[PDB]
Design a binder for these strands. Structure first.
Lengths: 46, 93, 271
RNA sequence: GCUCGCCGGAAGACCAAGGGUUCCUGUCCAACGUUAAUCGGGGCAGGGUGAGUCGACCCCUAAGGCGAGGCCGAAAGGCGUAGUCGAUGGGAAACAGGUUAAUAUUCCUGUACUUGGUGUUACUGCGAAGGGGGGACGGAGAAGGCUAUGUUGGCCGGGCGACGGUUGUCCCGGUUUAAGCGUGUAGGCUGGUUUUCCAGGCAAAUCCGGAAAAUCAAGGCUGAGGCGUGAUGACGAGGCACUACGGUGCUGAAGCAACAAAUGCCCUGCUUCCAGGAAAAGCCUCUAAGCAUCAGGUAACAUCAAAUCGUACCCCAAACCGACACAGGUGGUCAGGUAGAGAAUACCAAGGCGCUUGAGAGAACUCGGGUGAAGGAACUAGGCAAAAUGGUGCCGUAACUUCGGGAGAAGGCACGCUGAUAUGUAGGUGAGGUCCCUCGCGGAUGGAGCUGAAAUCAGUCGAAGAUACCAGCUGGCUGCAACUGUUUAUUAAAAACACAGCACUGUGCAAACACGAAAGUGGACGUAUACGGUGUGACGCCUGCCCGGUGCCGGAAGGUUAAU
RNA sequence: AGGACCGAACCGACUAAUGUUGAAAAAUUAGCGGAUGACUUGUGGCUGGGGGUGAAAGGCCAAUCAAACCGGGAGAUAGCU
């Protein structure tokens, strides 16, 4: 059956990637919480 | 021209294997590990000027590093670059 | 020429076509075409603002000359063409100085026919000229509402506007609505009536024909749940309410004009 | 290794996405593998991915994103012009053969092609975020010409055969060759050329558009395939010499023709139909500012450059998405034989597999199937399930009907094999020869050869000739819904939703209406034959009475009536 | 010609049986509907929570939907267990 995760790298990055978190106020606050929690990978880039 | 300070840092090791060996003893090509940011003009110039031979053409691939592990600790090795340096008819090394 | 299709396969049983042998079978004139991307009924916020729109055939826009600015230069009608963006047909015309333009095609106008815009134009169908020079009681289409702006009244097929008065700087116009409106008399207008009247006689025949003009289905309000439409719910068919829009405003009677700026120009509302 | 079975429009082959070393070799069997394991997609180590031509990057753009200024907004921020990004689309160029354990249009051999830089030489008006062309583009249908590919004959090499026969109307195998370059064909489109003039293409224009003449009747554009060359080369069934028996080298015959034939190519064509079918760059042209014995343009030759990243391997799957080595999901490409209308179906080729627990026994019972005396719905909520029907041709076919249907109504008959008509016909294709020449990829004649239905007559076999697989059960009365469609992903597919059609009502354009603190945007580059809302729901005959209540529309006299 | 007819791919999901600590958190097998269209599909884009989208089922919005998920107010409150 066709499950929910149908992967695509270009949609992974355009959607949840770094240049797209940095592109706005609230994604920068996301990166700030991931750095402050102290996190090995911030976004999902590769 | 390429400066000689750049041109010394490019070639890194001769690559020893059996594909390399049959490339030397069968098709004049010496195979050698180069700098990761080394272009084909740099490798050609560096073999022209550091082994004093005449290079016909260079072919460069980039080899991806293998994820090994020690114990239960993984790690990728490291990517390197391998240059197939096709020499002319007059060569030794 | 309207044609009833023979009833092979339902779906064709009720279709009436409006065929026109004088339309150009071929490609339109290219440098008066441009891209017309379809929207889906959705504004710059992405949201559906006008419902029921979407799909349909790909269409190219045709720059139709509504202004009719080339004054005094005659133009022969080169051909007539199908325009997908309108109810009427468009005539491709060729001015004497070698410029082609598309105009709305009036009623009698065929290929090889002289039209002429401007003040000293002859009064005959196809000639755009200001309404201080048109006689009272003449059918007139493609009417401007502000001088220099372009035609906006009576553009849809088979539609005309009658000039009934010339009191001063204004002409009283019986719009196709039935409404009497004052327009400034310097506004150009094209003589005759616009010419595909039989457009209204076609009957479409099946559901997919509506679909291919870009008209998605209309779910009626009473078939929904109360969360969706004010008509909603009820254990079999159940109306019981005064009929409203999906936003609660009364349909079936309730007047929704509020302008106050253009009420000066309305002599009598429609009836 | 020999047999046996399974897939073969896939369970073969090649990719994209996705994964990321799973690829290949050596080595180990702890754990992982639903068992054992010497094996493995497991552990450990080593190896492996070679590009001017493939793809990305790059040039150009769609939807859409972002957006200097800007308009807007308590702030955050919204929208958006110039612009700038964004492929799933447009834009230069390589093919055959060989090779590795593992890469190959990348390496090697042979033969090519493309775009830029620079230099020389000959001629020369060049020049844009500007003008024009072009790129540039729908659905369906129909043939015609081809090819891939296949079949048969010829040729060449080999065999004459475990059991009757098999020197022949016999058996097995091979019969392959590309890009590029040259020619220009079956088609398809368009009249061509010269001169003058002009309110158009923001300016200019020799370009485009337009208006006059004059002359010629042809020119041009495009185009599959074939043919020639590439190629006296490669490949080639097989033999020969050594053989770490794994193979390794050497040598190597024929290498043709006929017919059939695509869903591929001519074809972005042609015919037709409404529902009227991207953009921008490369490309070709025109000039403006400027530069004008310079620069630049064109042509030939030479020379240099073409960087960077991807390239392993799986990819309908044990490697991706499904927690699993999961009976599920996953886009594109190639598509052989026989029978067949066919990409169905049966059996097969190439190729790949036998599904990572086995050995027995042959109880009840469960699951998947086969058959069944007589009866034949008696079962049951209900013919649920099963059984039955099932092909092609011809005959024949009712009520009712919107005249289309109903209709494949219903119901029948024929069907294999052999021989003759006819040492294979009708038809298709069509050589050599002959005739003419505007002479060749020509047309006329001619029929050799190949292919080849279908029908009749005669005979013969079986219980049965649509023999397997595949492949309608039919009829009568009636409710609802007109019809095709849509819907409760995962107990409801329906009479419900939709629908064409009808009506009412709003809406005069800065439209009503909707999203939006606003700007703005959709409505719509539309304009009342249009658009929005509401109900009803093809079609036919129709749609009666009630305005007291609630709503809406209209009226303005009087009563009451806020801020002030 | 056709929201035409029969029928594979392709899309679907009408019936039955199995399965129901499944091979599978919705499938398999045998039949079944559509199959040139209101079709189907790939790649990208857009719409967002009292909001979207809806041929309307209160369906769908990441195995979640009469108001998603995450985090916080937050140790809500619980005359109840």
């Amino acid at each position: 059956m066709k499950r929910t995760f149908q992967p695509s790298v270009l949609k992974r990055n355009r959607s949840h990637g770094f240049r797209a978190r940095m592109a706005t106020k609230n994604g920068r606050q996301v990166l700030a919480r991931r750095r402050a929690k102290g996190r090995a990978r911030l976004t999902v880039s590769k | 021209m390429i400066r000689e300070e750049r041109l010394l840092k490019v070639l890194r090791a001769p690559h020893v294997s059996e594909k390399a060996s049959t490339a030397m003893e069968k098709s004049n090509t010496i195979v050698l590990k180069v700098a990761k940011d080394a272009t084909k003009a740099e490798i050609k110039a560096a073999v022209q000027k550091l082994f004093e031979v005449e290079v016909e053409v260079v072919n460069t691939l980039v080899v991806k590093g293998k994820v090994k592990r020690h114990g239960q600790r993984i790690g990728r090795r490291s990517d390197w670059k391998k240059a197939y340096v096709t020499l002319k008819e007059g060569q030794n090394l | 020429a309207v044609v009833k299709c023979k009833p092979t396969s339902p779906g064709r049983r009720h279709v009436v076509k409006v065929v026109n042998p004088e339309l150009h079978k071929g490609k339109p004139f290219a440098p008066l075409l441009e891209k017309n991307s379809k929207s889906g009924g959705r504004n710059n916020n992405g949201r559906i603002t006008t419902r029921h729109i979407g799909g349909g055939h790909k269409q190219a826009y045709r720059i139709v000359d509504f202004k009719r600015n080339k004054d005094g230069i005659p133009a022969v009608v080169e051909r007539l063409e199908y325009d997908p963006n309108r109810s009427a047909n468009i005539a491709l015309v060729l001015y004497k100085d070698g410029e082609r333009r598309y105009i709305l095609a009036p009623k009698g106008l065929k290929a090889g026919d002289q039209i002429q815009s401007g003040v000293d134009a002859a009064i005959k169908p196809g000639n755009t000229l200001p309404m201080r020079n048109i006689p009272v009681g003449s059918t007139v289409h493609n009417v401007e509402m502000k001088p220099g702006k372009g035609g906006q009244l009576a553009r849809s097929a088979g539609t005309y506007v009658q000039i009934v008065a010339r009191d001063g700087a204004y002409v009283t116009l019986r719009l196709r609505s039935g409404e009497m409106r004052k327009v400034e008399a310097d506004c150009r207008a094209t003589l005759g009536e616009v010419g595909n009247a039989e457009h209204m006689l076609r009957v479409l025949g099946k559901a997919g024909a509506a679909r291919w003009r870009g008209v998605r289905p209309t779910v009626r309000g009473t078939a929904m749940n109360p969360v969706d439409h004010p008509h909603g719910g009820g254990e079999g068919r159940n109306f019981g309410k005064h009929p409203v829009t999906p936003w609660g405003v009364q349909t079936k009677g309730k007047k929704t004009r509020s302008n106050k700026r253009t009420d000066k120009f309305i002599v009598r509302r429609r009836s």
